[PDB]
Structure formats: structure tokens, C-alpha cells
Design a protein around this ligand. Sequence first.
Ligand SMILES: [Ca+2]
Ligand SMILES: [Ca+2]
Ligand SMILES: [Ca+2]
Ligand SMILES: [Cl-]
Ligand code: NA
Ligand code: NA
Ligand code: NA
Length: 433
Amino acid sequence: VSPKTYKDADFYVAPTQQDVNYDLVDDFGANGNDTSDDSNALQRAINAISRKPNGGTLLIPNGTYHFLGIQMKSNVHIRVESDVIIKPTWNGDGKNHRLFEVGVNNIVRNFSFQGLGNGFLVDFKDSRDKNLAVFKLGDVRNYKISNFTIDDNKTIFASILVDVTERNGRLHWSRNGIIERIKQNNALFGYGLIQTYGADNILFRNLHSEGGIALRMETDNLLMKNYKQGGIRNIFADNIRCSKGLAAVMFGPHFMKNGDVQVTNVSSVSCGSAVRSDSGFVELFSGCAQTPAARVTQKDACLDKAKLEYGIEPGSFGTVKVFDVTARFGYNADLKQDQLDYFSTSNPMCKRVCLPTKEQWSKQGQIYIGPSLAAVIDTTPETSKYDYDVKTFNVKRINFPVNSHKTIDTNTESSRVCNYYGMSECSSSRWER
Ligand SMILES: [Ca+2]
Ligand SMILES: [Ca+2]
Ligand SMILES: [Ca+2]
Ligand SMILES: [Cl-]
Ligand code: NA
Ligand code: NA
Ligand code: NA
């Protein structure tokens, strides 16, 4: 097969006329030379621009700014100078925080946030806040988020949450947008750059995450389960990359029935795999039940009962095709404990696999650092009425050791060769990167 084509205008349409062009510092008094909060200045700028019928552009000039909980609005187009550094303003309330919210508490249409030149920096390195996301998207359409680097510090939450929001008794989420040219450094394994919950017609392009997963299409927001609304459809991705992480692209529908997704040009360097697909599954709340929340065993006799009794069923994806996948072998990939047994073929002595210390990660066993395992991991139940397929084309591996796996699936044999809790401890340098 040949990938479907598209043009940027199929996702985002830029304004052709605007009413104003403001500067955050000169027009709204923000200060990029101190360490004080600039949120109000930015919010006033956004509000002022959105009040104009044809909106306008806001320039965030070179300097260091502190923002938190900014509410984006319609017809606001933010451009950021190339030497800008954006840091999260300290908030000790202990709640989940985001630098920018788009359509979470309102309706946003025609919005863009783009770095000029080679992009700017969002820096979390000096933040005492571990619950940080850069963008949380909700009811927003016709948008573009582009060009910046995120210096993470293994914070909780993916940097860009393509989420759902509740309003008037139902869920709302984004449609028609482009999220591109973003690099994330030092992400926590359980997160990464993008996590998608609800989305329609979004283009993800030139995204790279060091650690975790770059494009995590793991649709598991509880709200979507309760409302039976959400999921992603007609998603396009191009040039998605992973380094020292789990995977560049991952599919994990959980309980949600998602639509079509096309991905082209996926590359990984020292990641668990380049592409990873997890089986959809069902969970019951208080050989059909797993060790408990209680996940339902992957058996069509038990699942047929699940759909009958609870009406729920394992999530899935529609037509999914991933073209041009390249996985380059490395020794610093993020690995899950249930993947370690796959070293039985190429690494029987489990060499180069480290277990992070309690200081590095309290829940020992949730993450390991070691050699890449494959180009593609697909744990979807091939022999099941409840299954979806992620078709891969032109998959290639580089520098993998002899007898390593290319594609790990449900038929792949494995055996325990690693000492789960007694293996070598990860050095600080290796964990901290
Ligand atoms: Ca300031
Ligand atoms: Ca720059
Ligand atoms: Ca399958
Ligand atoms: Cl997340
Ligand atoms: Na001005
Ligand atoms: Na300037
Ligand atoms: Na985060």
C-alpha cells in the first residue's frame, strides 16, 4: 500500500487578515528579565486580542517568562522569539498544572502558538512542580502548535494532552489541528511528548521525545469511559521519533473504540521498539478475571460475557497503517518488566540491563533501562474477535545483535533470564541521562 496524501490546509487554516499585532512586554508589561510571574500580562494580552473581531498576533519577545494556567482564546495567534525561555510559575496547591490550557474551560476556534526561527525553550529543569503539562487541549478547533523544545525533568504527564472536557452534559475535544516540530528532553518513562484521548483530524509531525513515548495514542481517560464518548479518528502522523525511551509511536486503546490512523516515517534510537501496539482490554470496578480494579482475561469466551453483562468491550483502532519504520539499536532504552523475558534469545545473561534505585524511582519494577528489544512490538490478540491491526510497512533495524527480535508478537517465545529485583542498579548518570 501507499500512504494517503494530505495538505496542511486539510488540518489548519491560518488567518488571512487580523486586527492587531501586540507585544507581550511593550503592550502588556510582562517582564522577561526577572523571576516574577508573567501570567496576568499574558492573559490580559490574550483577552485583548480575542475581543477583536478578526483577532491578532501576540509576540512574546526574547526573555525568560513564568506562566501557569493560561487560558487561550479564539483568534489569538502567539509567536515566540527564538531565544525565549518559558518556565512554569510556582504554585504549591499540589494540583495538576499546565502552562497553557486551550478549550478546557471555554470554546476556542482559530488558534496558533508557534516559535519563530529554530524555536524556543520550555524549561522544567528548575521547577519544584512535578505535575506539569505544557498544553492541555479541550474544545479547540483549527489550531496549530509548533516549534519548541521542552527540557523536562521527568515530570508527571505528557507535555501535550490532546484531551476531552465536559460541558453541557457531554464531552468535547479538539478537531482540525497541527502539532509539530517539538523536541522533548528527559521525559519520564510513563509519559512523553503527546498523549491523545479525544481527537479528530489532527496532524502530528516532526515530534521527538527522549524518554517515554513521543506519540502515545493511549486513549484511557476515565471520562471517556463514563460518557462513552471520545477517542481519536482520522489522525495523521509523520516523522515521529524516540530516543532512550519506550517507543516513538504507541497504540493502546484500552476500552475505547478509535478510528483510523496513518503514520509515516517513524524512527527510534535506543528505544524499546519504534512502534508498539497494546491489546485493548476491559476493566471491572467494585479464568475471566485477572489479579486485581479487575482486568478481564483475554479470552473470547470471557469477553463475550463481558459485552453481555456490562456492555463494555476491549478498545480498538480502525484502519491503522505505519509506513517506513527504522529502529536503531541502543543500550539505554526504557523497558517494562514484562518485556525483559524477550532478552532470552539475544541476551541470555541479561547484560547491560539496570534497575533504577528507589531514590531514582520508588516503585521498583515499573521501569528498567537496557538494550533495545525490537523494531515493532504488537501484543494485540491475533486470534480473537476482539482485535485490531496495526499494519507496518518497510520496517528496518540497524545495529541489532544477532538473534534479536524484529517484531515481537503474541507468538514470540520468551523465558526469564533477568534478575527482576537483584540485577545491577542503574548509575545516576544513566538514569539522569
Ligand atoms: Ca517575569
Ligand atoms: Ca532558539
Ligand atoms: Ca492484531
Ligand atoms: Cl499524560
Ligand atoms: Na505595540
Ligand atoms: Na525581538
Ligand atoms: Na509532564
